[PDB]
Design a protein around this nucleic acid. Structure first.
Ligand SMILES: Nc1ncnc2c1ncn2[C@@H]1O[C@H](COP(=O)(O)OP(=O)(O)O)[C@@H](O)[C@H]1O
Length: 412
DNA sequence: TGCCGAGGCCGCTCAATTGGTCGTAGACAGCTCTAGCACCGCTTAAACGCACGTACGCGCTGTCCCCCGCGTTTTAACCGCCAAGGGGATTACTCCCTAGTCTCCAGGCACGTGTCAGATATATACATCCTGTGCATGTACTCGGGATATTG
């Protein structure tokens, strides 16, 4: 039976939890598309004690017009396909986050910040995100990095130079990232235009067509439960669906999702039987052709990037296949990935598949551990004055960050 | 009996359709126009469409309560028929008049340009006309009783 989600927690703090040693403790801000995750670096403690503000990245303002609201509670959100592209709907998302974390007082946030961004970020987008940050909030110095690569940095066996493929899958994108000597080989990195949002959207539209008698009973927040709790990824889809074909297996494995009641009441207050549907929603990232979409999918793409290298460095970078982010949470994901990988390697060769320690939070914990180390490496950060000579389309090439290129944007 | 008378099958000859072959004449497809002026691309400052609670108007709804429907059959002539008669619609011919062709011939006017005006649009101020509302009676109605008209 379905549950309902929680809302409106009580995060309130003093003006700044400044510890011993250096006073400018940075904010660690994972600016996610599904949800934002934000908090103080809190140095000198091994386990990250409190990743506060776990909240959905969505805002309310309706037919009333005169007000808007920002916490977990018609709706809007600041992103287009995992790049932020909104003005004040970004501000009132930052404002919520700062106010609930506490801030000093004066006409700026006194603390430096580390902020996640898109695997590639359009130059205009980076420029705007820098302007909307330095101008309005007055931050002293800033760092941009990629969610996935922070999660890798967290999960590495050692704080040392590495190579691998990162497999990442968030709200509206999945990416395959080849990395060599700690550097993202962004020349031949690739992404797929699908993700967990689109899975839920498909599972919704399926069950709407299965039970037209009660369109209103099924809605995204209930699709979330069946997709998180009750769905799994096949080892081989055309074989799973084949064992699902016989009634004696079906009845033993179909999921009985009881709606809340007011004929045994199921003619409207149905038990929403999900069978094959609990496979067809996860599978979208491996076979986007279950939707209309003609793209290679996470299987053909991995082969298509992996055959663009010399045969020795393939055998190097496949030694660390890493799973992180959103959709990798499905049960069975490691097994499907390592089976699909076994067919596309030399007959006796070796590979290894690692799953992130906490697939959803390790991006933030990574950004924490990174900033807490690189406090004083002033070649890594963008300082407030640099933004006055370099127009905002500028970045500092540390590991776990997008590849910079010399370029400039006309503005007046 | 008879005879034959009446009787039942098969090549000429003509008269539409049908399809074929002859040759020749504009009219169709196409080219090059060429030429130019519309389509487009490129900006601009622009109007008007459109996605979106809430007051709330009325579309739809649960009751009882009766005529007109619903059912029958007698009959009543309506409608159908067939057969006969008369002509008038029809057919086939001969004489006849003009429909149609072409050709010459003119100027009527429909065509076209050449200028630029009285026209009507658009704004601002505005007063006024017109709508929506609220509000008495006056009639057009439904009924009952009797006179006149008309059917059988
Ligand atoms: N436990 C889970 N099982 C399955 N899917 C999950 C789970 N938790 C989150 N997701 C999916 O993860 C996606 C969001 O992941 P996230 O890393 O926050 O995205 P991003 O970094 O792009 O904002 C959502 O589409 C959601 O459906």
């Amino acid at each position: 039976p379905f549950r309902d989600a929680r809302a409106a927690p009580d995060p309130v703090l003093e003006a700044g939890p400044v510890a011993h040693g250096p006073l400018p403790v940075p904010l660690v801000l994972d600016n996610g598309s599904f949800q934002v995750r934000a908090g103080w670096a809190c140095p000198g403690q091994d386990p990250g004690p409190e990743p506060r503000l776990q909240f959905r990245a969505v805002c309310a303002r309706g037919r009333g017009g005169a007000r808007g609201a920002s916490g977990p509670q018609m709706l809007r959100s600041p992103f287009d396909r995992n790049v932020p592209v909104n003005l004040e709907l970004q501000e009132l998302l930052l404002d919520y986050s700062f106010q609930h974390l506490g801030v000093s007082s004066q006409g700026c946030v006194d603390h430096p910040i580390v902020l996640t961004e898109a695997v590639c970020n359009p130059l205009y987008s980076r420029q705007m995100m820098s302007e909307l940050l330095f101008e309005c909030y007055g931050i002293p110095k800033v760092a941009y990095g990629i969610d996935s690569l922070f999660s890798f940095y967290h999960n590495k066996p050692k704080n040392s130079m590495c190579s691998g493929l990162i497999i990442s899958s968030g709200y509206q994108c999945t990416h395959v990232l080849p990395i060599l000597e700690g550097r993202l080989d962004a020349k031949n990195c690739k992404r797929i235009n699908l993700g967990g949002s689109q899975a839920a959207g498909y599972l919704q539209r399926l069950l709407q067509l299965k039970y037209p008698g009660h369109l209103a009973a099924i809605t995204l927040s209930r699709m979330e439960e069946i997709l998180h709790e009750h769905s799994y990824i096949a080892e081989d889809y055309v074989e799973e669906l084949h064992k699902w074909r016989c009634p004696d297996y079906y009845e033993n494995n179909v999921h009985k999702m009881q709606l809340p009641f007011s004929v045994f009441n199921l003619a409207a207050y149905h038990q929403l039987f999900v069978g094959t549907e609990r496979i067809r929603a996860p599978e979208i990232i491996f076979q986007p052709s279950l939707i209309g979409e003609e793209q290679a999918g996470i299987a053909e793409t991995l082969q298509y990037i992996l055959d663009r290298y010399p045969k020795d460095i393939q055998e190097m970078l496949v030694q660390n296949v890493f799973l992180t982010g959103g959709n990798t949470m499905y049960p069975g994901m490691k097994a499907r990935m390592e089976k699909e990988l076994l067919e596309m390697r030399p007959f006796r060769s070796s590979f290894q598949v690692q799953l992130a320690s906490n697939p959803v939070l390790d991006a933030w914990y990574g950004a924490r551990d990174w900033a807490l180390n690189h406090l004083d490496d002033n070649e890594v950060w963008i300082t407030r004055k640099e933004y006055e000579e370099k127009g905002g389309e500028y970045l500092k090439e540390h590991c776990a960050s997008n590849i910079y290129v010399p370029i400039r944007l006309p503005k007046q």
